[PDB]
Design a protein around this ligand. Sequence first.
Ligand SMILES: Nc1nc2c(ncn2[C@@H]2O[C@H](COP(=O)(O)OP(=O)(O)OP(=O)(O)O)[C@@H](O)[C@H]2O)c(=O)[nH]1
Ligand SMILES: Nc1nc2c(ncn2[C@@H]2O[C@H](COP(=O)(O)OP(=O)(O)OP(=O)(O)O)[C@@H](O)[C@H]2O)c(=O)[nH]1
Ligand SMILES: Nc1ncnc2c1ncn2[C@@H]1O[C@H](COP(=O)(O)CP(=O)(O)OP(=O)(O)O)[C@@H](O)[C@H]1O
Ligand SMILES: [Mg+2]
Length: 271
Amino acid sequence: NFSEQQLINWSRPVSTTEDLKCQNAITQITAALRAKFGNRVTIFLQGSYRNNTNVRQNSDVDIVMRYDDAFYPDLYNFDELKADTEEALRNVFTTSVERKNKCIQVNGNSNRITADVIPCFVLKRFSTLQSVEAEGIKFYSDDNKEIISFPEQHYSNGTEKTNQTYRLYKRMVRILKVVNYRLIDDGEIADNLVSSFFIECLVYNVPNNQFISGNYTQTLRNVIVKIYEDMKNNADYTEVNRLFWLFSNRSPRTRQDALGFMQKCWNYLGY
Ligand SMILES: Nc1nc2c(ncn2[C@@H]2O[C@H](COP(=O)(O)OP(=O)(O)OP(=O)(O)O)[C@@H](O)[C@H]2O)c(=O)[nH]1
Ligand SMILES: Nc1nc2c(ncn2[C@@H]2O[C@H](COP(=O)(O)OP(=O)(O)OP(=O)(O)O)[C@@H](O)[C@H]2O)c(=O)[nH]1
Ligand SMILES: Nc1ncnc2c1ncn2[C@@H]1O[C@H](COP(=O)(O)CP(=O)(O)OP(=O)(O)O)[C@@H](O)[C@H]1O
Ligand SMILES: [Mg+2]
């Protein structure tokens, strides 16, 4: 239903860290957090701006604030950390600050994008897949869930795969994110059937030899068919971080979710 050129267009990043409104958000929010926490935190990005997978204009940026003085000192429970983070932001951004289940949101304006600020601590956890202790981040949601993430390993492994696949790994992720948003807008799937993270992990497990240089239409066909068949075949997919399984008992998302999503994409694209 869509031409090769249309797929190419959909595969391009829309919002990036080069955007003035993104730079403005990061600069302003960083200053507000440093005013309270100084060097006791590491500030970095995760999510679509970090991995370069944005497909929507003026997308929100995920700014991680890792309180890590104990692990990275200068050469306290989470409830207090999140409250102190909300206070630091409210002192500067006042009515634009909204506490959320998993972050503090700083709503944007004409000159800056909206940001999700994610206070967190250092996390260390053993990976049986790689038989090593892995370092990531941990935080707690307002509904009492322990949220664990490995953004550095996610970033590095995804970058490596796109570098090995003629840059098509992330281009295919972006295409599927576009299709996801369209299916949601059309009311064809629930807005939480999949997530950007889930899509990124699914495509990551498609072997590199399925990505065909200069052929977006056939590469995308290969990607959808491979994930679809793998889901029917009970495949053991890894997260992009390669430290844990995608379909582990910690995750409520299922192979059936991925199978249904692939089917909806296939039908929408008209293969
Ligand atoms: N391990 C793990 N990490 C997650 C999960 N959800 C989000 N993350 C992390 O948080 C980052 C930002 O989350 P999202 O905003 O939902 O994903 P995104 O890549 O920014 O895509 P967008 O929907 O365009 O914002 C992702 O890149 C992941 O690194 C999850 O379910 N499991
Ligand atoms: N450090 C470094 N940066 C580069 C290099 N080549 C290009 N860049 C730049 O790094 C930024 C990231 O570029 P890309 O990784 O190609 O991202 P993109 O072009 O927006 O999207 P895709 O190519 O589809 O992944 C851009 O500003 C490029 O100009 C390089 O060899 N080394
Ligand atoms: N496993 C995870 N690991 C790291 N960051 C996560 C994460 N899940 C969510 N986040 C981050 O927290 C931010 C908020 O996540 P969302 O998916 O919007 C739920 P929420 O918005 O916090 O609940 P709410 O809208 O009901 O208040 C995301 O932008 C993301 O950057
Ligand atoms: Mg995001």
